[PDB]
Design a binder for this molecule. Structure first.
Ligand SMILES: NS(=O)(=O)c1ccc(CCC(=O)O)cc1
Ligand SMILES: [Zn+2]
Length: 258
């Protein structure tokens, strides 16, 4: 790939190959609570996922993805700022080199250890992820900040699956899992129009950032960093980090559901 998180192909250099990197709707961003607008037209977030839609876990070199079958509405996101139903298709994480950083979004300048992203595409208006991916209202991603602390038992199935996809390109069946079990108890959120946090960086994401964080232990984070970005047989290259720095709001307004 022509992009990554290293010095030469990293976030700071993405604009060379992907000009949109310097766009007006880029993510992640720093959420300044003193500037958020408490909107009353925002309904509660509603998620209903079918564990049978879980399909496969894949090492994609810079991270790993857990994909879901998206041929129907068995797993969907509704409510919040949406009028359309969004179909679940994947969830993944972002982490940093050390516990000091790792999340992509930040709140009042505070950086967390990792971040969970649960992605969905607008099946009410579009026919596929491919079509929806580049549409302004095509994607909806829930972001959950992960604060280093007690080990999180709900991450167990995901963590135990990593040993089967250690190197780039490896993939394995990952079934019977409901990602709503990874979300915090409260679904109060912030929302703003943004983009994918890595190439192609399409500004097609309506973000849903949870106010409440979830926990993750230092050892669990070590497991993410123990994944390898190289292909089997080559010198091991640990996946140390994959979080993009926060970008300028460019006048966008972050709304709060609380
Ligand atoms: N980081 S993020 O903005 O939550 C995000 C969500 C979905 C994809 C689609 C990724 C793919 O299919 O390779 C990429 C990035
Ligand atoms: Zn992400």
């Amino acid at each position: 790939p022509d992009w990554g998180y290293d010095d030469k192909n990293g976030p700071e250099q993405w604009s060379k190959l992907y000009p949109i990197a310097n766009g007006n709707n880029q993510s992640p961003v720093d959420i300044k609570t003193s500037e958020t607008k408490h909107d009353t037209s925002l309904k509660p977030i509603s998620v209903s996922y079918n564990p049978a839609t879980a399909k496969e876990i894949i090492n994609v070199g810079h991270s790993f993805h857990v994909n879901f079958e998206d041929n129907d509405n068995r797993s969907v996101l509704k409510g919040g700022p949406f009028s359309d139903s969004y179909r679940l298709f994947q969830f993944h994480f972002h982490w940093g080199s050390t516990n000091e950083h790792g999340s992509e979004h930040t709140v009042d300048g505070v950086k967390y250890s990792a971040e969970l992203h649960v992605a969905h595409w607008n099946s009410a208006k579009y026919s596929s992820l491919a079509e929806a991916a580049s549409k302004a209202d095509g994607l909806a991603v829930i972001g959950v900040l992960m604060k280093v602390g007690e080990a999180n038992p709900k991450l167990q199935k995901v963590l135990d699956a990593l040993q089967a996809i250690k190197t780039k390109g490896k993939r394995a069946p990952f079934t019977n899992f409901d990602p709503s079990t990874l979300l915090p108890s409260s679904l109060d959120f912030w929302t703003y129009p943004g983009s994918l946090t890595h190439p192609p960086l399409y500004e097609s994401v309506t973000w849903i950032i949870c106010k409440e964080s979830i926990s993750v232990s230092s050892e669990q984070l070590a497991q993410f960093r123990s994944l390898l970005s190289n292909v089997e047989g080559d010198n091991a290259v640990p996946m140390q980090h994959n979080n993009r720095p926060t970008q300028p709001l460019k006048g966008r307004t972050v709304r709060a559901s609380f």
